[model samples]
Target: MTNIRVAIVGYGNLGRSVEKLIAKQPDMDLVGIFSRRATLDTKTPVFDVADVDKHADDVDVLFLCMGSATDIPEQAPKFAQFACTVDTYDNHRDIPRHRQVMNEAATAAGNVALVSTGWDPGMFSINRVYAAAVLAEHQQHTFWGPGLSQGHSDALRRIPGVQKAVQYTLPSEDALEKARRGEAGDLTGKQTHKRQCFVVADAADHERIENDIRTMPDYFVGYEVEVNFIDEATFDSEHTGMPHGGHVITTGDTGGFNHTVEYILKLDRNPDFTASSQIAFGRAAHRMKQQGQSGAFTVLEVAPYLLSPENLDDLIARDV
Candidate 1:
C-alpha cells in the first residue's frame, strides 16, 4: 500500500520528532519540511508555511507545526488548498474562532480540510475529560506544575515582560499574596486576573478543594488545582543540593478536608515534552481513526481508542 505522505511546517523539536517517527511507520512518509529560513540543511526538503498555499496540492497531508501562538490566525487560513487533510497545532487563545476559521477555509477550498490540533490545551482538556470518568466521584483535580527546563526558547522567553504577564494572569489569592511578598510573580506592571478553565467544574466540585481553601482553620487546606511556580533557581538548586523534589506545601485546612488529586508534573528535566505530547496525540489520533472518526475530536472521545497496554499491539503491530 502507498504511504500517506506528510509534510511538516516547523523545523523545531516537534518537527524533528515527527520526521523521526514517520520513518518508523511504513504507512507514513516524510515528504517535505517547511520553515521561514531560506537555507536549511536537512535530508528532507524545506518550505515555509507562509507559502503553504502555493504548494498545498503537493502532499497527502500538511502538518501546521509552524508559526507562534499569535500568528496562527493570520497564517493558517492560507493553506486552504493544500493536501487531503490539513492539521495544525496553533491557535491557543481564540479556539472557537480558530475552528470556525478552519471549517470555513476547508469548506471553501473544496479540496482541503483543516484541524486545530494544539499540543497542551487540546491535550489537557481532552485528557481531563478522559480522567474525569475514573475520578468522577471525586470533587476536583488540580492540573499544574513548574515549567520545563527544556524548550525555553529565547524568542519565547523574551516576549516583552512575559514573567510579569504570568504573574498578572494568576487566578488565586495565594498567587496575589506571593506577588505582594516580592516573590517571583507576574510582569512588572500587569495586574492579576482570575482564571478557571472549566468554571462550572470548579462550581460542581466546590465542596471539596474549594471549600477547604475558604473555610478550614487548619494551615493545610485549599483548592485542588493550585498552580505552583517553582522558580528556575529553586528548581535547579535542588538538583545540586540533596535529594530535592519531595517537598509538599499546603495552604491550610480552613476549607475542610475533601477528596482531591494533585499532580506535580515535573518537566524541569524532561527533554521531550513535544514528542511526548505528540506521541500521546498520535495515539489519540490513531485511535480516533480506527473508530472511523475522521474529523475534529476531543481527547475524551478518543480515549476509548487510545492505546493501552492491552491494545497497544493491535494498534502498532502492523507491518510497518
Candidate 2:
C-alpha cells in the first residue's frame, strides 16, 4: 500500500506531539506543518495558517491540533474540503453544535472527519458503548478514586465495626442543579466519588465488601471496579456538584441480571492520555478514508474498523 500523506495544522503542544508521532510512522508521510507564523521549531516545512486552504489537497489526513474547540467548526470545514480531518476537541462527541459542524463539513468535502477523538470523550465513550452491548439488560458504572466508593464507603461506616467515613465527588452539574432546586434527592447521572473510610475491623473484611457486592445476582460481570488506598486526604471539602458516576441500564426482565462498567479518570495525567487518544484516533481516521466512509463519526461509531489485521501485526510487534 502507498504511504498515507498526513499534515498537522495549528502548532501547539498537541500539534507537535502529533507531528513527532507521524514522523515515526513508516506508512504515514508528514507532508506539511502549519501555524500562524511561518517560522517554526522543526526542520519540516511549516506553512502559515492562511496557506492551508491552498495546500489542502496535498495531504490525505489533516490533524487539527488547535487548543480551542471554537476554531474547529470553521477551520475543519476548510481543511476537509480535500482531506479527511480528525479533531481533538472535547465537545465533538457530546455537544450537538460541534457534531453538526463536523457532519456538515464531512458532507461538503465528501470526506470523513472524526471529532471528540481525545481521551475522556474518546476512549471512555467507546468503553461505555461496548460495555452497554455486552452487559445486556441492567448495567451500573461508577469511577471510584484515589479514594473509595461513597456508597460502599458509607456502608463501611455502618459495617459491624467502623469509625468515620467521608466521601465526595468533584462538584458536578447534577449536584449543582440539586443545590439550585433546594432538594436533597439523588442525581441519576454521572457521579464521581472519592472517600476516606476508617474501619475498626480487619482490612481483609473491608476488602470483602466489594467482593460481596460483585457476587450479588443483580450485578453483571462487565463492570469496571477500581479501589485505591491513599496516603492522606486529597480533597478539602465536599464538591458542590454531583458525584462523578456511571449509567445503570435495566433489562426490565425478571431474570435480575445487569451489567456494570466504570471509568476512573486519573485527572493528573489527562493531557498525556488525550495526546495518546489523538494518535490512536488519527490512525483510525486514515483507515476511515481508505474504507470510503464519509461524515462525522464518534470513536464508538468506527472502533470496529480502527485496527486492521495488517496494522494489528505491526502494532503488536512494536509494542510487545
- Top-TM-score structure, candidate number: 2
Question: What lDDT tens digits, residue by residue, belong to model 2 across residues 1-320?
Answer: 68778888888767877777765566788888878876888998888878877876688888888865577756766776777888877653445677777788787887888877875466666776765566554333433234324455555455443334443333343444333332424544334222233333446555664454334342212333333323223323332112233322212122653222444455443344466567667677778777777888777788553734356667678755
TM-scores, in order shown? 0.53, 0.60
Sequence-dependent TM-score of model 1: 0.53
**lDDT (C-alpha, whole model) for all candidates:** 0.45, 0.59
The superposed Cα distance between candidate 1 and the true structure at residue 253, in angstroms, equals 18
What tens digits encode model 1's per-residue C-alpha lDDT throughout 92-168? Answer: 56766766766566556553343544334544555455445554433322323333211212222233322311211
Clashing pairs counted in every model: 20, 12
